[PDB]
Each structure stands twice: as structure tokens, then as C-alpha cells.
Paper text:
The most frequent PTM reaction catalyzed by FIC enzymes is the addition of AMP using ATP as a cofactor, coined AMPylation or adenylylation. Enterococcus faecalis FIC belongs to class III FIC proteins, which are comprised of a single FIC domain and carry an autoinhibitory glutamate in their C-terminal α-helix. We discover that EfFIC has both AMPylation and deAMPylation activities borne by the same active site. Furthermore, the conserved glutamate implements a Ca2+-controlled metal switch that tunes the balance between these activities without conformational change.
We determined crystal structures of unbound, phosphate-bound, AMP-bound, and ATPγS-bound wild-type EfFIC (EfFICWT) and of unbound and sulfate-bound EfFIC carrying a mutation of the catalytic histidine into an alanine (EfFICH111A). All EfFIC monomers resemble closely to each other and to structures of other class III FIC proteins. Mutation of the catalytic histidine (H111A), of the metal-binding acidic residue in the FIC motif (E115A), or of the inhibitory glutamate completely impaired deAMPylation of AMP-FAMEfFICE190G (mutant panels).
Numbering used by the authors: 5 to 207
Amino acid sequence: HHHMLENKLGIINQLELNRVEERVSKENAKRLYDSGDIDRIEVGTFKGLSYIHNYLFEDIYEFAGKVRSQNISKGNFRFAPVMYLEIALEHIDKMPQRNLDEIVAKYVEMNIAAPFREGNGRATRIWLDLILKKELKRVVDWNLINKEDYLSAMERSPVKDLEIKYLISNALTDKINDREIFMKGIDISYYYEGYTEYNVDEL
């Protein structure tokens, strides 16, 4: 267990560590967008996801953007055992992304893979939007996706991706250059994970 800022700042409370982590990474997410850096990276690849994860969590989480060395025990959900991860990430890279069916299937596959130690959800929600922006000229208006519905559809996706597919298509917007949709979407993505201390636009 190693979070680069826990021993740097006197952090004794998990709530305080979670507070610093959200603040620092939200500032990184803001810069990723405004610098235009978000639009100069490989779309729908592990290389692309790795870039986002490292950009958000460098200096916060150890091995940011790097593939994990052990298995994930987050709930009863079956993430890919680490022995399958090299093969899994190569398959996802080669998966087609022509339409919503193909894009959702790809996203479900990346959610199962969960290649990093932690922050898989937040980095893959940004990654997804970039596939939608490039291939459909759409993004998700995350304000149209309720938290409880989102998690339920995600738990179900290894069996059937129909529920998550609906949530995304119904939330799709053509306002791909709308800064507020991106910023609000960052706060919602963090809310799905229990981080509500800050509003990235106030950073």
C-alpha cells in the first residue's frame, strides 16, 4: 500500500488523503482539457488510456499509467486476473470502434481488464468520451446518467451490455466543444466513485 502523498503530507486520515487526491487529480484533468493535450493522444488504445491515467495521477499514485502486477478484489465483480492482462490489452487495442455497439463492447472489455492498480473507472470514462468524439462526433452528457443506474449497468455488462449501451446512447450529445459538459462530467465521474469534496471548475 503506497500513495505518494500519504508520507509527504502528514496524512493520517483516509478522508484527508482522498481529499488531496481528488484536488490534485482534478487540477490535472482541467489542464489535460484546456492545454488541448486530451486531443493529441492515441484514441481507443491502452497507450491512450495509460497517458490519461498517468496525466491524472502522476505524483499521486505510484506507477500511474503502468499495468498492475497483482489481481483486483473490488467487490464480487470479476476483473481480469493479471496473468491475462497482457493478452487482454492487445485484444482491446485491435477491437473495432466504428459504431456505438463496437464502442460500448470495447469499453466493457476495458472495464473488465481494469489494467491499473487503482483509478480505472475515472481514466476509462475520459478514454470512452474520446472514442465517441473521434468516431461518432458525440460525447456523454454524464448529467443524463444516474450513479445507481450506471453501476448496475456496469455490474451487468460482462453478461449483457444492453443496459450500459442504453445509458450511453440516451446521454449522447453533439456539443463536443462544450467545456461545461466536460467539466461537469469530471465531477460526475468522481461522484460515481465517492469523491465530492471539490468542483473542478473552482480549481
